[PDB]
Amino acid sequence: LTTLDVTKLTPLSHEVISRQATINIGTIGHVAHGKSTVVKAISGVHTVRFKNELERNITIKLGYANAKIYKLNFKLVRHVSFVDCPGHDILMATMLNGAAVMDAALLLIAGNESCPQPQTSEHLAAIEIHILILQNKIDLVKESQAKEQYEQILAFVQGTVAEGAPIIPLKYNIEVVCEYIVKKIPVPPRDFTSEPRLIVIRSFDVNKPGCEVDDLKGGVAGGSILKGVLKVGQEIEVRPGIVSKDSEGKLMCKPIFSKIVSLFAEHNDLQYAAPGGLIGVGTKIDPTLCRADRMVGQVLGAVGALPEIFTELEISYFLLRRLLGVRTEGDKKAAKVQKLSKNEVLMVNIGSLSTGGRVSAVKADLGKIVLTNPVCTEVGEKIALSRRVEKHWRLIGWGQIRRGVTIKPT
Amino acid sequence: PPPLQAVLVADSFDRRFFPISKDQPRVLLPLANVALIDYTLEFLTATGVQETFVFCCWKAAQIKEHLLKSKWCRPTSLNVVRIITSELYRSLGDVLRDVDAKALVRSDFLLVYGDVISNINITRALEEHRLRRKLEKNVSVMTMIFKESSPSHPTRCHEDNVVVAVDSTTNRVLHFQKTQGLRRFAFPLSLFQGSSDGVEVRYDLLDCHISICSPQVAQLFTDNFDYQTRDDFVRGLLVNEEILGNQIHMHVTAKEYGARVSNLHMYSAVCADVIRRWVYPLTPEANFTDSTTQSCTHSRHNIYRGPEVSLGHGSILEENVLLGSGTVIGSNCFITNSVIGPGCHIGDNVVLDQTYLWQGVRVAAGAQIHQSLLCDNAEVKERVTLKPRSVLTSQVVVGPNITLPEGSVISLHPPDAEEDEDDGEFS
Amino acid sequence: DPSILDSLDLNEDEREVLINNINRRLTPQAVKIRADIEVACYGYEGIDAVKEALRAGLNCSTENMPIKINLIAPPRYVMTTTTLERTEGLSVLSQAMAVIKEKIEEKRGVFNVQMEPKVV
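^ inputs. structure came back:
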């Protein structure tokens, strides 16, 4: 049981005021969606069950898992949120679009085989960037374990070019990994004094069917806060808002204003929200505007964020020649990113804002991407560029916004 | 259940009708003196649809003007039609994304194109879809309508031929592909692992391009923003089956008609079928779009005659001929298997075989016209012969003493037309 | 009121049987008036305005006729009230719907009547 209060001015990453989630640590490995068992053994199985709906983007949404590390009748020392999405490509694209995401990593390597999945994981770790590799190949002979350790050390010798000097080796391994994480993970510098800014990654409608007119709650949004601290009762605004084109003209976006009536983590959170976790800021928004995942892709500002609404963006890009770390046995032009074809839909991913964009024009140094929906990110931020080759979106290159079309409706 | 809804895409996002479509949308092209939009609206109204959404982008002004004067925009029409226009539309995926954005639909709507000729009643298919959805708890996301056919039929164009592998006991679509340019078809083994009890491979299905969809279809379209066509959705959904199952089923009709006009071959085939009463009760004499101009009487050998046709002496109408109001036919003529629009003027000793003449077409004496299309107010001078597969666009004249080849397409627009057209034939 | 039937001079058991038959045969007073309305406001206090409009509409319920307004879908609510004298019930439902629409429009919102009041 915690005793969080509403009296704080300059909190810290390791401060005990929050003690829920302050540091986000990534988890990319060759588990192939098998890391759920390790996460449950390290954090808990049923720890996250507070709002459910019909899933929409299973493989394109980043998922978190809150966990508090306790040490020495035990006292909690640190709290870290483990992030593990299906497919390392999405996490790599999201992380390498700025900063303040996945401050730590855990390479879930395997001691049984050294297939191309470890190479892809190493390439993703190098591209995204304090890593901590760990082998989950349990139930092996002592000689087999020694041979696997030797092979892992041989691989890490090459992998140490960027970051390859970790050490790790059923619950005993989990405890050892937890101790190593507590000992080695450093506190990242987060700007708590800045204005709060939240990016929505999950929307819900808590009002159950056939409810009374008294117990009618709505506007239970969600997402992650990068810079700033959100306090209950503050007047918040949605940067995207409601976008309509019924006026027989250009798309018009009207921002939505509300007040933070609640703030809920996996457990019961206090009136103040801290960066580095999945905090659901339930405002006084009508559930009709916020149904299941109908608000995803909007930035919940506080004081009218300067980022204007952008319809099209001129981005100078450096397309990567081949697939990052993907060299299959065949490689029959599959791992070869072609040039930016005109009228081609690409997944523009600015930080954690996953949106869609088609290429309108390009002359050898800069494309003019028209987005499927307006976004409010920046005027010169780094925007990644992705494209699926076979039913799987994968990173294609980088980008830098130079100009755009602004929409400023009242 | 709420009233049945329908999304009617009134713009084909592909240009298969240059240079005809350069001054008139394909949706407004007259098939049998009646526009395709009227046919598809009648099909939607007759099957119980009570609310229709038309999404028109290319030349949306003409479509809007034509619709506002039509029967279905009257206050007495049970099929309420909503007209939504946008220049940003580029594909059917954009239309479905907009539908999901504005939340037009609530449950189990209809997806059809604006050039679908049909008389299909979807009551049984809708009931099967709803029962399957209720029993499986939101797994079946689409029910596509197919018509039993034969690969050798004129309606089975090479472009739109499709082979489908299905589960015979539940009418579930397991694989779906087009056979354009393929001399040999291939099927993955993953079909046989699940439904090993029964799997059928069908090539005798004609795609009516009618689907019973759920709002989950629009949700999936807006999730995968790169989707542009229904085929893209079907393929991407069938390949991504291990996660988000979202299976697709189908319905087969045998005694009902349905087909969409995609090119001139389909146009001619569907026009021939309509004239020969294959789409009953959507016949030329039924006047399902009630209007004084498009009234006609049916006679022996499928001869439809309008008011004041004034046939000449010695002219013979063999069979399958539709004559518009105010038309004038000369003497010793021979018209067969042809549709002639209202107000046409025809000279003496002409021959018309499997030809189509739209409004205002004037033909001089002695012409020989076979298997060709003549658009609005086209003119043919004295003693001109048009070989099959010829197209004359609007306001096009052809000079005397010329035999156009078997592929002549001429219009007033130089680049798109294979030959720029004017008051002369050569240069 | 069985006072009139008391003046009958048939018997005690006969009077009891007649009263029971009359009360069990000619007393089918049961009617339900149902309607559906989609009202929502995309304002600063959206959920608050929706709740206020719903409360204002429900406050118009008369005696022995509680309008049990419930949410069918996130954008649409259903008003159901099992009140006899359906002629008055339809008018009561219409008045409640009009009051709710006025309250919603006053709070800078949107309201529409999906289905008019009707019997079950």
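The first strand of chain C starts at residue 32 and ends at 40. The domain at 33-119 of chain C is CATH 3.30.70.1130 (Alpha-Beta Plaits).
thumbs up if we can close this ticket
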